[model samples]
Target: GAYNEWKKALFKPADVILDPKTADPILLVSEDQRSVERAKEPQDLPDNPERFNWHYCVLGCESFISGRHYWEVEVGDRKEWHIGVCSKNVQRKGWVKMTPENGFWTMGLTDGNKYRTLTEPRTNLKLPKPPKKVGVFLDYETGDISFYNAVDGSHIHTFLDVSFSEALYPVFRILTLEPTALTICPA
Candidate 1:
């Protein structure tokens, strides 16, 4: 007995993946780090949060277990650069969050828990099965979000590009509660 709403809306959710196209995500940049002269320098990123996002305060001296970080670039008009996510800071947590570094990436609430991660550590991330769809959010210059199919890795949708505004500070939330949404566990 499957709820039709959940079923119909099921495919609208996202899953774990390595390819940047098949992920649902939310992105944030350190604005405080970018200086007045640097902001207009045509540089997509100053290399670190302390120099680009202006508000380096977002990521302070708090050291964590993971060292993951995602980045963006303005490459073209309709096309842009999207790096991916990384579980770079989680010292007290031990395990890194589901980021691009793990090889596979996912975003969503796992049965009510918040998460976006890889089933494997860098290989064998499963493609979603039928009855599910993937999502993507690309922050071209600022941060964008998009979606796709997890099974075949098809492009379904795109959102939040830098062309709109770089100050959005957008973020993508990958939903992993669905079956077709989960990345394959490593062997």
Candidate 2:
């Protein structure tokens, strides 16, 4: 499904170059679409007052109208990794960023509006905290989103079986635990 969708949307390596007469509006077909106010740069979570306290946080603009299999991996051993979707929207534009005590760091995945797991929420009974590093191997060639363990260099998870509506990007954080390195796979 993703493969088909990708092909239908783009063809022949930038073949559909937009011209004045040929240009067509990029339709916002997704009712579940979202727009994140891109931060010009990464903002730091304050630690001087104390460790952050993020029991809850809402990212991006608009209400939480998405139902994807969102996930959050804890950075420290203090707690287990928590993964879930954004329940609902709290605002139309402004989003809340949490402190270290409360916010998620390292890696967290969201279903966005367009994407939903075939089985809805998917997770093992055991929710493991995030390893040192993580990677998103999205096969634009295949239309799949797979995850791998950066530490042991093993397969961690795979979503062969999903449908998406909203477009989203990975939101990450690093509290006291900073990733030794960061790498993003090419499309």
Candidate 3:
């Protein structure tokens, strides 16, 4: 009951579009801004500090300030991908490790489709089955970031007691040459 209530209370339809400014030069965003994939050739993007240079990552345009928000992402035929949220002031230069201390609360399908949580030392997340769609939830006041298997509505994982000072934005990372893509859905 409490879990359902919390889920219901935190549920809100979010229209998140991929922010091209924060995307890697080799990553391409669809015209609709809902889809992102690795490009065969790098686009002519400015070498800005806000852009990701070493990682295949992109942040969403909408940032959460102090409310609950949820969004579903579709990983279509992607073998390697990361999904989660990061602080607005997260480091975009050099190699930044994915950890709460680094302002990144994320999980992903790493090498060989291995599920892993992007924390300090990184934890292996075993799922009942591979999820085609993932639901990300953020409770700003409670400092919680939760993820779910949108295909079956199963609880995936949650990060608690997160330190929140700046706003948070959705972050996605995909690494591969198999023509894979990630799409933000309206579920």
By TM-score, is 1 or 3 better?
3
Candidate 3 per-residue lDDT, tens place, 16-35, comes to 99889999998999999999
lDDT of 1 by residue, 86-186 (tens): 22232212233433333212333233322223334422223233213233333334433444443344543332322332122212232112222122211
Model 3 spans with C-alpha error above 4 angstroms: 1-9
Candidate 3: lDDT over CA atoms? 0.86
RMSD per prediction, one decimal?
Answer: 16.9, 14.6, 2.4
User: Alpha carbon lDDT of residue 164, candidate 1?
Assistant: 31
Which sequence of candidate numbers ranks them by TM-score, best first?
3, 2, 1
lDDT score, residue 83, model 3? 92
Models ranked on lDDT: 3, 2, 1
TM-scores for every predicted model = 0.21, 0.32, 0.91
Off by over 4 Å in 1: 1-84, 90-92, 95-106, 112-131, 149-181, 184-187
